[PDB]
Symmetry: C3
Subunit: 290 residues, 3 copies
């Protein structure tokens, strides 16, 4: 006659009419009750009536009872990356050059045509103009060489007369003026001897020109052509030791040959005479150039 | 006196034929003879440190307010890389620099009339010739003075006409013509003519007789057709009736150019009765018109 | 056994077991519950915990998380998209610039420094060379857009209305003349008209006072010779002057030249050719030229 408990299955056990329960770590006594033991704080908690897992709600969420990352935890990142992607420089076209390693951007330039200003600005390399005399640099700009516009010199030499067997020479001191493309030889008045109706007066430029003027500087632009250039009247006083009679003769530049300028002197009739008084005469003609 | 004790039990305990047993669902099991929590596999749960704990990579996660939270260090590398780019990078380009945001290509806009890219990828200014106006011209590569302006020679073969006080006559002559800088020089030779008046005109007809490429217009003075007294000078003219000429000192000047005809005034110095005149060679010069 | 009270079966129990009126029960905290007749772990809601595979398991997205050494670990693939997008930018991007290229690191704006005098940005936004007027010096000048010769240098005309004064061995007098003036290249030409004067000597001076009488744009200084105030024998020529005392003129072939310009007065020398007794002089028209001073 017994209706009590005389044996028990694990985790229950009986000793001397007293029953106890064996518990592994994880299960514990809480007051009079059996409880799940959760040491420390590892995201597990007894709450809302049972065992739950706890997670930051800004970083995590539960989807089909699975722990899942909140898609927003990445938004800040993708936002910053999308900001750069939408508009940035990845490649550069010449003259632009991009070193993909040091990520430095520079530009290729021709050093003969372009340069870098002290203030880092791109400037066109200034160049001096290529000029040919009489065009020249005048106080910094493209101008006309002063030497072309006016050059003064001097000739101290021999004038020779020759006509119909009559011959004689005189020495003159003469200013020379070169102005643009003309030379002017300013012969002074002088005395000579008999002259023919027609004859030539020769200026020997082979010697007597003041340095640095040279014989070749007196060559006409028509070189050694025979011309009738600069024709004019000259009044020459003819006498035989008394009052001279003035004859109106015709004079022109006739020919330059090897540094000797020949002038023709003819016309106006003549008289018997032994001496001639010549006026100052300026003789001009276009000058040779290179 | 018998104390017979427990005779019934409530779930999860039950008694049958004097034996008590405890029923268990999955999750609860026996570890020997002790009650235990069942954790199949490896899902982050473990019995450790006295009980049930959740396990996590300590470099990626931390526990804050007993809440599983992402450790910030996890993003440190991402934040450093993006920050390194953000601090300095090109997002926009100002002209002439151009940025195509859809291809990430940076190029530059250049005017192809003044600039270009050479064979070595360098930016170079186009070579350009100076813009020059005659008589300034290119002389052997440089900016110089046109040789043609400095000296040009031609020739006129034509008629000089005298006119004075009902006297008229003509003489065919040839004459070299020299144009030098802004002057023209017409080099007439000596010639014989007929009776002249005390005062009168000598006219050169340039409408014909000029040697190509010279044209009539090239003989126009810089003062055009105004009446002037230019290049006044003395000319001795021999007058006679067949005998020995008597030379009159007359006064000659350029008076007017009209329709290709250059008129020279010739007057002064007196006159005598005569039928013939011996004219000296005369050079006529004046500043010449230009464009 | 003299024991006054005999215990049979189970008469007491340790917590969590308890006995009331011969019934044994189990006390349970939240987290433990009854599923039918069985003890069960209670998992309220859905928080990643589940009874499955025979026990208590934790559930996680298998694309985002993984288990290493029974630890919850972030699956490395979840940052792959981010690491590639960033890396793509890294391999090639402009971080810095070298002058004249200029990058504002704070606005992400790239531009280029240029000289405003030698370079410009045209209408179509291109970089173009600034068209610049060449540095010229008169008489070289701009002529309809090209480097040319100033028309003013090539030919300029005016007039002098003034006094010509004769002086010579006591004989002196003056006459008013209107004279065209032409300046051509580096020369000045004074075109004196014919005029009448009084007694002249064998040698004498004819002076032109340019201090007054010049018509603008000409000024006195414009008549200075290129040889300044040197005494010269320039442009020497023959001039026939008619001498008389009321009757028939006798024409003397005299010799005239430009001799000296001083303080705006151009002095011409007139000598030679003999002379006679006379009270009147009939001068011809005479053009006087010389090279002109410049700057
Ligand atoms: C996630 C968590 O909170 N874990 C706790 C656990 C769980 O709450 C428990 O395992 C669920 O069954 O408990 C831990 O022990 C604490 C717990 O027993 C409570 C119960 O009241 O007492 C805490 O300290 C008490 C202490 O008993 C008193 O003497 C003291 O005067 O007051 C304290 C509280 O103010 C226990 O420490 C555990 O280790 O299992 C603590 C975990 O953090
Ligand atoms: C995270 C982890 O380590 N999971 C283990 C678990 C847990 O450690 C365990 O549930 C905590 O209580 O153990 C696992 O292996 C056990 C499992 O096969 C059970 C099934 O009943 O048997 C266990 O051996 C027991 C056995 O059941 C008893 O008869 C014996 O008297 O005691 C043994 C020791 O407790 C295994 O250890 C599991 O699957 O639950 C393996 C997981 O990896
Ligand atoms: C993570 C999870 O699944 N949580 C469940 C839990 C766990 O399954 C359980 O605690 C583990 O032991 O169960 C919850 O209760 C549900 C559970 O008891 C089932 C058992 O079959 O019944 C559900 O009630 C339903 C029932 O299924 C229907 O037959 C009935 O007609 O309607 C009821 C609902 O009105 C329980 O909801 C729990 O809260 O512990 C539910 C969790 O979501």
């Amino acid at each position: 006659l017994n209706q009590g408990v005389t044996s028990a299955g694990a985790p229950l056990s009986i000793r001397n009419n007293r029953m106890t329960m064996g518990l592994n770590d994880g299960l514990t006594l809480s007051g009079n009750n059996l409880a799940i033991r959760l040491p420390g704080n590892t995201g597990l908690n007894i709450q809302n009536g049972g065992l739950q897992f706890r997670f930051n709600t800004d970083q995590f969420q539960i989807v089909n009872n699975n722990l899942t990352l909140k898609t927003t935890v990445f938004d800040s990142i993708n936002s910053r990356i999308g900001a750069i992607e939408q508009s940035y420089v990845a490649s550069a076209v010449t003259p632009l050059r991009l070193n993909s390693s040091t990520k430095v951007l520079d530009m290729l330039i021709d050093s003969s045509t372009l340069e870098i200003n002290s203030s880092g600005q791109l400037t066109v390399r200034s160049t001096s103009p290529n000029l040919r005399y009489p065009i020249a640099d005048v106080s910094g700009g493209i101008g006309m060489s002063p030497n072309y516009r006016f050059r003064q010199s001097m000739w101290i030499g021999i004038v020779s007369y020759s006509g119909s067997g009559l011959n004689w020479r005189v020495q003159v001191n003469s200013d020379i003026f070169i102005v643009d493309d003309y030379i002017h030889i300013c012969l002074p008045a002088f005395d000579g001897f008999s002259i023919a109706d027609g004859g030539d007066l020769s200026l020997n430029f082979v010697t007597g020109l003041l340095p640095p003027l040279l014989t070749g500087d007196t060559e006409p632009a028509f070189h050694n052509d025979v011309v009738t250039y600069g024709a004019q009247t000259v009044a020459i006083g003819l006498s035989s030791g008394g009052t001279p009679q003035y004859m109106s003769k015709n004079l022109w530049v006739e020919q330059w040959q090897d540094g000797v300028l020949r002038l023709r002197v003819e016309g106006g009739g003549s008289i018997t005479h032994s001496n001639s008084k010549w006026p100052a005469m300026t003789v001009s003609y276009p000058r040779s150039f290179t």
